[PDB]
Amino acid sequence: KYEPF
Amino acid sequence: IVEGSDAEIGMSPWQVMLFRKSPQELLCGASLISDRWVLTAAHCLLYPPWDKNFTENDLLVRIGKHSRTRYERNIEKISMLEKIYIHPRYNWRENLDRDIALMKLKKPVAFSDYIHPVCLPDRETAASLLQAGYKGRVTGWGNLKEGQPSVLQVVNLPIVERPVCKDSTRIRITDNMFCAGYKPDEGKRGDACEGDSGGPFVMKSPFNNRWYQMGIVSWGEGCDRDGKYGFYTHVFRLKKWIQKVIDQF
Amino acid sequence: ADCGLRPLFEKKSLEDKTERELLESY
Ligand SMILES: *C[C@@](*)(O)[C@H](CCCNC(N)=[NH2+])NC(=O)[C@@H]1CCCN1C(=O)[C@H](N)Cc1ccccc1
Numbered sequence: 001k002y003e004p005f
Numbered sequence: 006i007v008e009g010s011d012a013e014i015g016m017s018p019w020q021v022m023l024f025r026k027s028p029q030e031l032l033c034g035a036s037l038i039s040d041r042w043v044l045t046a047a048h049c050l051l052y053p054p055w056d057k058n059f060t061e062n063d064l065l066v067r068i069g070k071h072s073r074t075r076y077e078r079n080i081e082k083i084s085m086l087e088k089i090y091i092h093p094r095y096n097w098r099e100n101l102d103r104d105i106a107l108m109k110l111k112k113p114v115a116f117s118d119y120i121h122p123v124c125l126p127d128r129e130t131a132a133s134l135l136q137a138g139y140k141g142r143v144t145g146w147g148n149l150k151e152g153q154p155s156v157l158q159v160v161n162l163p164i165v166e167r168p169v170c171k172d173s174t175r176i177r178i179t180d181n182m183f184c185a186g187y188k189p190d191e192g193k194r195g196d197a198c199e200g201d202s203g204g205p206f207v208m209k210s211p212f213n214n215r216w217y218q219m220g221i222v223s224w225g226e227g228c229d230r231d232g233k234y235g236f237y238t239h240v241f242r243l244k245k246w247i248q249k250v251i252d253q254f
Numbered sequence: 255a256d257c258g259l260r261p262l263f264e265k266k267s268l269e270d271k272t273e274r275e276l277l278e279s280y
Contacts, residue, residue, distance in 0.1 A: 002029045003076040005083055015262035016270050038257075117261070124257035140279040142272075161275050209273055211280050215258030 006145050006158030007229040008195035014071060017144045019123035019218075020157060022067035023049055023203055025059075031153075032059075034145040034204025036218055037068060037122045040113035042251060045203030046221050046238060047095040047106040054097070061086040066108065069119035071156055073146045080119050085111045090250050092243065102179045104202075104223040104238045107250050123207060123218045130217055131241035134208045137166040141185060141208045141219055143235070147200025151228040160195035162186050165234050173234055174226060181242050183220060184234035197235045198228035206237045 012020075021035035021043050033049035043066055050059050068082045088109040096102035114120060126134075140163045146154060162185040170184035178184075185206065187193045197204065206220025220237030227233055240247075263270055 001074045003074060005076050013270050015260060018260055116256075119261075121259075121261055122257050134280070138279060140276050142276065159272075161272055163279060209276050210258075211277055214264055216260070217258060 006143065006147060006154065006160050006195070006201060007150055007198050009143075009158040009160035011154070012071070012144060012157040012159045015119055016159065017157065017207075018069065018119055018121040019205065019216075020070070020144050022070050022146065024065045024067050026063060026065060031073065031146055031200060032064070033200065033202045034147075034222060035066065035108065036205040037114070037120070038125060038218070039122055040116065041110045043108040043110065044205070044218065044221065044247070045106050045108060046104045046223055047091045048097065048101055048104050048223070049203045050089060050106055051091055051095070052097055061089055066110065068114055069117060073153060073155055073157075082114050082120060084114060087111045088254065090254075092246060100177050100179065101224050101236075103181050103243065105221060105240075105243050105246070107247065109254060123205060124215050125244065125247065126217045126219055126241045128241070130210060131219070133212075134210065134217070135164060135183065135219060135241070137164050139164050139208070141206045143197050143201070143204060143206055143222060145197060145201035145204040145222065148198040148228060151198065151230070153200075162195060162235065170234060170236075173232060176224075178236075181239050182223065182236050183239050184236050185220075186234040189231040194229050196225060196229040197222040198225070
């Protein structure tokens with residue numbers, strides 16, 4: 001579920 | 006972290022996330038010791054039995070984070086590594102003896118409310134605080150159980166006497182390690198767990214009110230089992246090697 | 255230098271919720 005940077 | 010709680014904002018500003026570029030994945034914890042240097046457990050980089058061997062290029066470091074998964078748009082700093090240094094006598098073959106590594110950041114980070122280095126212990130600070138019964142604090146984004154938290158977790162754990170440590174495992178313990186947790190009788194619990202490695206074990210000095218890193222999350226068998234304890238790399242003991250690399254590079 | 259002194263706590267003379275637990279153990 002990592003939000004891009 | 007098992008049986009911990011959500012950190013408070015700015016509680017552990019030296020806390021760093023070890024992040025894999027692709028697949029994007031939380032690797033481990035780490036800690037900020039200066040504006041250019043990050044401390045972590047060598048087994049987060051190199052662990053051949055599992056085919057793990059990461060390079061500068063394999064990773065990113067995320068600083069000043071709170072949320073595990075969200076991009077903390079004006080708070081966190083993402084940095085690339087310039088150079089990785091592994092303890093030359095790190096023992097991946099038998100017991101994770103000397104489980105420590107330094108990471109040199111490409112460009113220095115700017116310290117903020119959410120970003121600030123922890124102190125490295127001195128011979129004297131180690132001597133007074135590293136005693137059975139004294140509690141330290143562990144933080145991380147690892148497994149909640151022997152799962153992934155949404156925010157950084159914290160737990161306060163007491164140091165345990167060497168002999169108790171020794172009698173809890175079949176693994177050969179060395180002077181570069183210490184164990185911590187509650188005794189089953191004590192009926193209070195909590196521990197680090199997988200994904201927590203490289204995270205700092207910290208103590209607050211009663212003399213000068215400063216936080217010191219005494220340990221690094223290293224290994225355990227299971228997470229929060231009765232009769233078992235978390236094992237940590239003894240920072241003071243590997244101090245000269247740390248000095249030695251920063252003085253050289 | 256400034257190490258181990260947290261901008262939102264020590265620096266402002268504010269304590270986090272469980273740091274007393276550590277100092278009580280010493
Ligand atoms: C890297 C990590 O996140 C992790 C931390 C585990 C901490 N656990 C507790 N309960 N405090 N470390 C590991 O996974 C290490 C690296 C390789 C194996 N390992 C272990 O903890 C094993 N479970 C046991 C072990 C195997 C070999 C040598 C020493 C320990």
